[PDB]
Symmetry: none
Amino acid sequence: SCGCHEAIMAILPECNGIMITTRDHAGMTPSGMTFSTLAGMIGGGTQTPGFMGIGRTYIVSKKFISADGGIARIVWMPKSLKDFLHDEFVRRSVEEGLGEDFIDKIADETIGTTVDEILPYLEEKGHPALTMDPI
Amino acid sequence: SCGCHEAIMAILPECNGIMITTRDHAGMTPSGMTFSTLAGMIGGGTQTPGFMGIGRTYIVSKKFISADGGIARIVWMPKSLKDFLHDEFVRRSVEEGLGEDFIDKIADETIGTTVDEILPYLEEKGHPALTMDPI
Amino acid sequence: SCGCHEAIMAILPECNGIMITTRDHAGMTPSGMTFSTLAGMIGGGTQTPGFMGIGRTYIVSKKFISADGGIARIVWMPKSLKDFLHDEFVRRSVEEGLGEDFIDKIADETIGTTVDEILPYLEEKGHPALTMDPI
Amino acid sequence: SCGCHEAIMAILPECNGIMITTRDHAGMTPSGMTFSTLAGMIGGGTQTPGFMGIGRTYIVSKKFISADGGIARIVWMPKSLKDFLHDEFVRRSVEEGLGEDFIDKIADETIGTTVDEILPYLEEKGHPALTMDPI
Ligand code: NI
Ligand code: NI
Ligand code: NI
Ligand code: NI
């Protein structure tokens, strides 16, 4: 009704995956835009390739971008979103064969807010997205 | 209301642009999917960005993927769609500084249904998408 | 607002052309379906191709199914539609070299509602579609 | 001779499977068409493919749509059809490794008559069609 679940996903070709941000998160993201700006960009029915609005809980559903590798594609999310989805997200990681600590391989704002800032972290943690087929 | 206006847009990174297909078009598209298959994929919430549903009329609107430089990004559409939108599409082409014959630089099913089939045509005709910044 | 909701086209291979029906025509068409049932299909889940929703005035557009050979392909329309488009249609027929008479070569509900009923009439009247390349 | 007039199949890409309806069932189906409207299409000036007429017992035949993955693709049928084939269908389900309760994962008119109505049910029951390759 009011949009309190609202999140925005964006493709990050250089990380071979997707970032997600949320309405409550003030911070810059690796897409070069805040949630606020992103929302402004798509906000008059102006669909833009590589960006989609989603409900924050769609992220932890079985069908989540399933045929393109599901939650394994997530390479960046705000720490606030990790915390919020944590228990579901972990249980989902496990179901997907990604292990319980997959969430810790995912970059966040404490790591960086640009691709150049987060990519070495993704690399050093061995994030599965980096070796999956092209996004 | 029945989705009479429905079209689907997909990113084609190698053409540095987008393709568009429609319900009434049976044919294979350069995305490697028919409209029907595309729709199947995103009606199930199976869809990642790079594929999305759009209204036929959004295509000729001033705000059409404005952040990405608008209709200049369209590198493939069914001929039936060109014919249908023709007058408005031509007007929009002119307003956008693409010239009246822009629609003829755009590939369609008579040219091919794969990237390898259409890319030479796009090159031949000097399609503006090719020299734009990355889609 | 393209007029999408007001008419539906369908191919009739045996007539080597197309039929059109409209929202105000409740009666049977050579497609074996009414406008309403055709609409139900479009709004349905099959994603069947080949049934374009159009505005009536698209029929008298310059590029009207130009990719398929234009108005010469129309083999059936409701009489109410003939009346609606008459003057424009005749004008278009002249421009296309089909003669002013063309509209009268086109079948309608007074002729029949099936291919078996309308095809001998098309043949009688020397409808140009019959001799054109396959659709 | 083969019972071709008993039932009609149609594809539902967003359920990644097929529906079946019968000459005994007048209810609306997820195809947006009733049996009788489907039959009308068949007979029918358009020659549109994809709507095969079948005998009810074809459904429980060994090679039933084997090319498309067999009975695992069925996502909707009238309850009257489930009852009619029940024992054979269950036997077939077991043989195919789908379990005895497969028939219960399949939607029917008591679940809904549109894709939007039946898709969440399919999802919650874990219908195998959803996990299969694109239909
Ligand atoms: Ni509609
Ligand atoms: Ni419209
Ligand atoms: Ni038979
Ligand atoms: Ni029959």
